[PDB]
């Protein structure tokens, strides 16, 4: 009967209708109610006496700035409550304590600055909690102590500076934790104590100066991210206490030296990307890790590749080793899953026919800016399909044609002293080619 809409399955929606108070005249048996995008400033004492059977209540974007402590009384069956984008300057401690059956509580997008000590007390059934985009200055340790059953907590976009010891000690059931976009500088030794069930930990965009030693207390981690930070070293065995790690985000940092065995015994890691780790000399001792699909090391001083690379990493697909000082190449046989190989800007000085032998599913090969001096005739014969092949800026006197009939895009720019010309009878599928000397393309 209200000016807003309705639904057959005991649901009422009144979003964006410009209401100033809760709508009256609705059915007593209402299971869901939406009042999100109306302009309501306060909830009186007797607001929700007419809806004893509410299960979901939405108030996002109401510009709500006051909640009477008795407003939510009587909603024993409430399960979902959203209050984001309002002007609640603090967590409504008194108002929400009567919600025994509450399971989801959204309070993000507010201007929360203080959390009373007795907040969230009595919320036995709470399982999800949002506190993003607030002006919080420290972790509410004691208010969180009253939520042993929490399963997902997020405190992003706040102004957190440091996390004290035993901050989340009683949240043994937590499995998701977000802390990105904060100003966190230091993590105490036992800050994450008791988070034995945590599965994802987000620490992006913070100001960490040293690697967090606390993550050694997390035995069930699966996803970890600390990019956009100021971390410079991953000393050694940092992930020793996280055997189940799968994804690591560390690709935007002033990384200078990652440990030789930093990534070691991580049997479930998928992607490993390290950029700008200049001081690294040896190859990462990534024994045990045999589930890699992408391996990217750039900007380092690696002088050699180990022969056992993909006879161990049989699942490897992308192998980027640009920059660095790779002088010799180990035989890539056993690299059956390699789709892309990148070796540009290296010290590679020759490609003997036994180097790229045995690769089948190769798709792209990059050898630009190297010092390749010679290639044996049959070096390219053994590989299967090829779509890209760059040997720009090397000292190639001659370039073989056998095995490149399937070639699509070819780039020899700057290969001066490559006098003797190619021919279209072997190179048949090309429609992209750039050659040193001049008018080498009069045949094509």
């Amino acid at each position, epitope marked *: 009967a209200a000016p807003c809409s309705c639904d057959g399955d005991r649901r009422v929606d009144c979003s964006g209708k410009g209401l100033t108070a809760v709508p009256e005249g609705l059915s007593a048996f209402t299971q869901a109610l939406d009042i999100s995008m109306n302009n309501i400033t306060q909830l009186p004492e007797d607001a929700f006496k007419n809806f004893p059977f509410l299960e979901e209540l939405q108030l996002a974007g109401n510009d709500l*700035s006051f909640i009477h*402590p008795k407003a939510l009384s009587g909603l024993k069956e409430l399960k979902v409550l959203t209050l984001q984008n309002n002007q*609640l300057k603090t967590v409504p401690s008194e108002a929400i304590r009567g919600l025994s059956a509450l399971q989801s509580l959204r309070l993000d997008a507010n201007h929360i600055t203080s959390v*009373p000590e007795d907040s969230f007390e009595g919320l036995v059934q709470l399982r999800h909690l949002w506190l993003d985009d607030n002006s919080l200055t420290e972790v509410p340790v004691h208010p969180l102590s009253n939520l042993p059953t929490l399963q997902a907590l997020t405190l992003a976009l706040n102004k957190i500076s440091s996390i004290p010891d035993f901050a989340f000690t009683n949240l043994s059931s937590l499995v998701v934790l977000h802390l990105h976009n904060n100003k966190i500088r230091s993590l105490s030794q036992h800050c994450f104590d008791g988070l034995d069930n945590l599965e994802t930990l987000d620490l992006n965009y913070n100001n960490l100066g040293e690697f967090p030693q606390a993550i050694k207390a997390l035995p069930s981690l699966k996803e970890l991210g600390f990019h956009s930070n100021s971390i410079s070293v991953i000393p050694d065995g940092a992930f020793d206490g996280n055997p189940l790690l799968r994804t690591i985000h560390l690709y935007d940092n002033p990384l200078s030296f990652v440990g030789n065995s930093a990534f070691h015994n991580l049997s479930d890691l998928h992607s490993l990307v390290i950029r700008g780790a200049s001081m690294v000399q040896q190859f990462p001792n990534l024994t045990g890790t045999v589930h890699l699909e992408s391996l990217t090391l750039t900007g380092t001083k690696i002088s050699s590749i180990p022969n056992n690379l993909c006879q161990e990493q049989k699942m490897l697909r992308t192998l980027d080793l640009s920059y660095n000082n790779i002088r010799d190449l180990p035989s890539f046989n056993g690299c059956h899953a390699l789709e892309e190989i990148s070796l540009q800007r290296n010290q590679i000085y020759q490609i003997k026919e036994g180097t790229f032998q045995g690769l089948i599913s190769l798709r792209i090969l990059d050898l630009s800016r190297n010092l390749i001096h010679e290639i044996h005739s049959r070096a390219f014969a053994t590989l299967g399909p090829i779509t890209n092949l760059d040997v720009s800026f090397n000292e190639l006197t001659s370039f073989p044609t056998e095995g490149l009939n399937g070639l699509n895009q070819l780039k020899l720019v700057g290969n001066f002293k490559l006098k003797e010309a190619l021919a279209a009878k072997d190179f048949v599928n090309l429609r992209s080619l750039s050659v040193p000397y001049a008018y080498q393309c009069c045949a094509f």
Partner: nanobody
Amino acid sequence: GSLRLSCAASGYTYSPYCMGWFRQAPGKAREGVATVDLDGSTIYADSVKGRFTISQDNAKNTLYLQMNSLKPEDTAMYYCASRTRAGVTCGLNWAIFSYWGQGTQVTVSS
């Protein structure tokens, strides 16, 4: 103006943990005016630091708030609020109080 903003608690007499005065401009949020706890400790707002004064008569639960030389900004509706249990720190936070009054109007002109 010698404006005495009295209050009265009718429920129970034994000293509640905390009692504050708050004010509300039309349509905006509730921001605090003053607070007093069981020990007699007192807190005021920055705009209220000197003009007003919160008092109390514990034996009778008549809790006054004295205002003099009211600024023209001081037009609002004032609420007397209380709390019983001790599980929080006293302060000018509207979310900790348990009982709220119907408030009254104070319109300062000139």
